[model samples]
Structure formats: structure tokens, C-alpha cells
Target: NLVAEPFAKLEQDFGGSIGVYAMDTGSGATVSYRAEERFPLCSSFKGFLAAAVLARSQQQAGLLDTPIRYGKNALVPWSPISEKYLTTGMTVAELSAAAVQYSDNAAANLLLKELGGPAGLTAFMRSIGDTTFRLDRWELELNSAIPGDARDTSSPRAVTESLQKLTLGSALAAPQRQQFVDWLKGNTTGNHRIRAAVPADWAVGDKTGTCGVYGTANDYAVVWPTGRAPIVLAVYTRAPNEAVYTRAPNKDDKHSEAVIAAAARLALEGLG
Candidate 1:
């Protein structure tokens, strides 16, 4: 109850259901806030895709750097590269960077296809201790109706567990894992979520997930506070209505994003 009190206040102010899970990766101390409930992950699944591809290349050296081209099918509106650089060739490592560092949906879909599609990703995730996580759609398909798998989804607890396994080096080779972590640390899209809540000097490596229609906003991070071991904290919020935030083609989805930032701040207070 002590750990969840701040999150309660956050939900009160933000008007939505929320979930959080934070753990000190070094000492194993943890705080859980409705972490079991299933929440849509949106672009956050890109992180998982990065992990899966990296894990597959553990035994084969130079696999990540193999040259590949961005396919026409991978192009989606949310992608930064799809429009201007269609069919451009880049290495697998570069695509992974786009997926993790830029949250480029088209790059993620290309990587997903390279890894043999969603089924392949599912197998890799289960091999790494996440059994219930799911990846149902490409980023462009979020607006379409496609039954259960239309939107990417995961629970806060599952994602936190996945991050823990990744940070601990069980999911990929040491060098590959470090690369994945570095890419996440360099993520540029989530400045206003977990990154906004932490101290400017504190090292925050995170990925953010946003779905305007579903009203889902999420931030998952590995935060390194001064004088403390890295912490894996995931914050997920779902608004009551479908239009809680503006529709697509609009970049200003700060309403729920602000809630994610507030929740991260509160979770940090609870951590201390």
C-alpha cells in the first residue's frame, strides 16, 4: 500500500486506470501498482522486437551488420523513413537503432519481418521468461479493425520482467544486450514521460508507447539514479474514453503523456 499511494493520487489527478512496476535491478526491491492488468504497448513492442533480433544473433557474429533494405510493405504513416527513404538499404543494426532509438514503426515492421514475423518474436519472448506478452499488429494497423491482435499489448509486470531478463544478460549475449540497452538509453521520443520526471543528471533509458484511439499511454524504463543501482520501472495509463487525446497525424498527445510523467515522478518518490 505504501508504494502504491502516490500512483493512487496520480490516477485521481489524471482520471484513468494506471499500472506501475519498478524494481531495483541490483538489490531486487520492488513496487507494484496493478501490474497484472493487460495494457496495450503500442510502439513499445519495438523494444521487444529489438531484443528478439539481437538474441537471435548471439551465436553468429556480424549478423546485426548484415545489409538489408527497407521494403515497401514496411512503410507506414507514423514512420519517419518510409516516405523519404523507401527501398533504402541499411544494415540490420541500423534498422534496430531506428526501431529502438527513434520508435520508427516501419523499421520495426521490417525487423519483425526479418525475424520471421510475430510468431518468431513470440517464441523469442517466451524463451526469455515472458509467457503472456503479445504482439498483434504492425504500427500502421492500429486504426484498423483486426480482432484481438489489432493493437500491440502487454502487462506492466510482463514488460518489467522482460526488461529485467534483458538487463541481467539472460536474453542476449553480453555485447548484444549492451547494444540494446544503449539504443534504449538513446531513445529520443520519450523525453516528456519517464525522462521528464527524473533528474536531468540521472541516467534514464526508456521506451514510450502511445495509442490515441485506445487512450493508452505508457513509459517503460531502466533508470539509474545517483548512488543507486538501475531500476526497471513501467508506467501504463488508459483513459476512459476513446478520444481522450487527439487523433492521428497530430503529434501533441501530451494529455496522457503528462499523466505518464506524473506517475513516473510519483513512482520515484515511492522508490525513495
Candidate 2:
């Protein structure tokens, strides 16, 4: 499963860089490629936001069944969702789905606001023993934005650890976890990096993030049913100019897919 050489080669073959981090849930073995490097998380940061909401809901014993009206102001102009989309009323359950499934920026913004903004999420992260993962104060302003500065950054080890918490069902209360998984069921990232390396129907619950011109891409999830041994993975990268037509070749899936598979293999090998 040692994926380092292959990923290093990918860095040479492709202009964009690659990072791979994996952990075997069964034996607690870990393997990584450039896992210490911090990368822009893009939409993948939403996963942490999602976990924050679930965690908060449990901590406060809030009601998820309660209906949450989507006001026009809830949909920021910069967000992917138009103000009209906010007219649709939903429960906390649906909001979670919209936030994680479609990568809905408006829903995420509103939910983050509901959880008391980025400060709230940062507090939650600290509570969960994650001091390295941090968010920006002006993040809500972008809504659907990925600023050069607001990368929503994290290292591969941090992400792998987060996924491990989710896998253990310790990240949220039982009821919230059930609801979160339902939102995860609606995940729309099959065509992305993490799943690209995994076999179909392998139970990989993942989320994807992409910046302008594939500026930065990330996918984090757990590969389950490893017979008491699951593989938690978080693959991330940064490609500031991947969208340039001249450099579009650098953003191809080959590099990302290879990175994920190689990372997964390394985790399995290390378990032995």
C-alpha cells in the first residue's frame, strides 16, 4: 500500500500535486502520501461543518424534525443557490441533505449560521480534539466562495482522523448520526476522486470540493466492510490554475484516482 513513489511520480507527470492519507480501522494502521501538507479543502470542508451541526444538535438535544423556513436572506448572492431556491421550506434533516449532498453553499452558510457561524464550528472542532483544523471569520461572506486565503485548510492526518471519528459513530449522537448518514446517502460525488479508486458499492461515504478551474480538489471518506477493519481516507490537492485551457491537461482524473487507490492499498498493506 505504500503510495508515496507513485504519488511523487504523479506530481512529475501532472502539473497539479497529490496527497493521500489512509487508516485501517481494523488494526489502526496508517499510511500516507504528503499527508502533512496543508491543502485547500474546498467543499470537503462542508463535511466538517456537517459534523459540527450533528454534534451540536446532539449536545443541545435540539429537534431535527422541526421545520426550518428558508428565508431569502439565507441564500447569499454569492452562493450557488439563488434567492428563489430558499423559498422552499425544509426541516433540519433536509437542510443537512442540501448542505452535503448537492454541496449547496447556501444551505451550508445558513446551517453554519444556525450553528453560530464559523466560530461555532471552530469551537466544535476544538471540542472534538481537533485543534489543527480551522475556519476563517469571513467565510460566510463567500457562501459559495473559495478564497486564496480562505482555503478551509487541513492536513491529510487531520482529515483521516476526522473520518475515523465518523466511522466509529462517535462524532455525533445516535439519532443525529442516523440522520447524517441519510444525508450521506444522498451524496453526489461518485464521479469524483475518492470513489474513483474504490470499487462500486463498496460503502464509501465521501464528499468532494472544487475551486475555480479545479483550483483545489478534495475527497474524504471511509471505505467500509473491511471485516472489522475499515479504511479511512482523505485525498486532497491544490491546482490554482488548473482551469487554464492550456494547462487543463494537468487536472485530469488520472492523478487523483491513482492517488486514492494507492493510498488505500498502502493502508491495507500496513495492516499486515
Candidate 3:
């Protein structure tokens, strides 16, 4: 009830639906609000891609450090790698870091290719005992101007479970797990969402996903308060109307993101 109250109010206030799931890693207590419903998970799917690649790295020697070349066609708007490293070769680890930390679409698509495309990511989820989450397309395909039915999607419960498995060291080997967590902790794009409401001293490793065309914005985090045990939280919001979608959706969409932040703040206080 404590965690659900704020989320409920926000759903009403925003006039849009929300899905949330939070768990105290220490006590194993949990709270959920519309957590089982599927929603578009734009860039947050990068988190799964990173884990899948690292898991493969454990089986195949030298896969992580092998250099691969990317061409101009791989470049996409809104990515740091596209701006700085156009038509360059970089290691799989480097590309994975860009995908996780900066939400780099080009890097993510390149990594997806290395992983055997979206089917490979879908296989990773199935291997981890998850059946609801789906990664069916690349970032570029997901952001297309033409409307499409096939897009990456997941439920709040699925995301929180992934984070929970990660926190328990089940997703990757120790070294690989450390690398993955570091990337998430350094994620540059999610500050205005989950990280925005947390205290400076609190530790938060998170990923943000946005699909303005679908009016979807989401944050998934492993949060550690000053003196309490770690917790996993996933908050997702979508605009009620299609008018919110624009060529530059993020430019005019602050309310949904703010609702996510407010929910995060409320959950943090209640959990503490």
C-alpha cells in the first residue's frame, strides 16, 4: 500500500496508465501496480543486450575484445557514438558500454548484430526464466517514422525481475557483472527520471527507455539508500492520447517523465 498509493495518484493525475514494481532486496518485500501489463521498452532493452553479450563472452573466449567495423549506415540520430565515431571500428565491450551508458542507438544496433540480432536477445530472456519480455527489433527499426506493430516490449515485473537477477549475480560472471553494473551506474540519460529524485549519497544503477511515438517513458533501477538494503524498482508511464507523439516527442513531453520521478521519490521515502 505504501508504494502503491503514490503511483495510483500519479496514474490519475497524469490521465494515463502506469506500471510499477518495487522490491526490497534485503527482506524480499514487494509492491506492484499494473506490473504485469506489457509496455514499449525503447532503449532499456539495451540492458538485456549487454547481459546477453557478456554471457556469450563467458562461453566464447576473446569475444568481448574483438574489434568490429561500423559504417555510416549504422549511424543514427540522438546517439553520441554517431557524432564522434562515425565509420570507425571498436571492440564489442566498447560498443556495449556506449549502448548501456549513453543509450547509443548505433552502438546498440551494432551490438545487436553481433548477438545475432533481436532473436538472440529474446533467447537470453527465455534462458533467464522470463517469457513475457520481448526484444523483436533494433533501435532504428523501433524509432521508424512509419508506424509498426513489432517493437521491443516488456512489463514492469519482467524488468524488476531482470534487475533482481542481476543484483543476485545470476546474470553474468563476477567480472562481467561488475562491468555491467558500472555501465548502468554511469548511465548518462536517466538522471532526470529515477536519479532525479534520489539523494546525492544514494547509489542508483539504472536504465531509461523512451518511445515518444508511443508516449512511453520508463526507468528501471537498483537503488541503495544510505543505511538500508538494496531495492529494485521499475516505473513506467505512457500518455493517454496520441497527440503527445511528435517528430521530436521528448521536446514537449515532460509530464510523463515527471510522473515517473514523483513515483520514484514516493517509493524511496516509503521504502526508507
Highest lDDT: give the candidate number: 3
RMSD of 2: 3.8
lDDT string for model 2 (22-81, tens) is 777676676777788777666676777877777767656554555677777567434544
| Residue pairs with backbone atoms closer than 3 Å in model 2 (clashes) | 1-265, 1-266, 26-229
TM-score-based ranking, best first?
3, 1, 2
Clashes of each: 0, 3, 0
TM-score of each: 0.88, 0.81, 0.90
Error of 2 at 103 (Å): 0.3
Ranking by lDDT: 3, 1, 2
Instruction: Give, for candidate 3, the lowest lDDT window spanning 10 residues.
Output: 142-151
Give candidate 2 regions above 4 Å deviation.
1-3, 76-85, 137-151, 213-215, 226-228, 240-271
Query: Backbone clash tally for model 2?
Result: 3
lDDT (0 to 1) per candidate:
0.76, 0.64, 0.79
The CA lDDT at 227 in model 1 is 90
